[PDB]
Amino acid sequence: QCVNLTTRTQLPPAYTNSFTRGVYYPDKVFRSSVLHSTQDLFLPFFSNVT
């Protein structure tokens, strides 16, 4: 819980594309059998992750 004891190696961070993850419910409303377009914060599709 304090200053490091060295021995901190640096792994190479491999990058993988997040296909369709990171989508949530933007509002606490209930709509049935619709197709709703929204402007909000999201992960871009096929964006690389760390």
Add this chain to the structure above:
Amino acid sequence: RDIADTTDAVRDPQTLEILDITPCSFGGVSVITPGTNTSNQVAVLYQGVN
């Protein structure tokens, strides 16, 4: 909400039952009148309402 952004499905303020709320019922009042000089009696039709 719904297609017309109208309330169609309602969470029970209390217990966990599912409620449905529709707006006020109404209709279209259409009258079937003869000539004013000829007669005075009016038969009324209700538009699309049982």
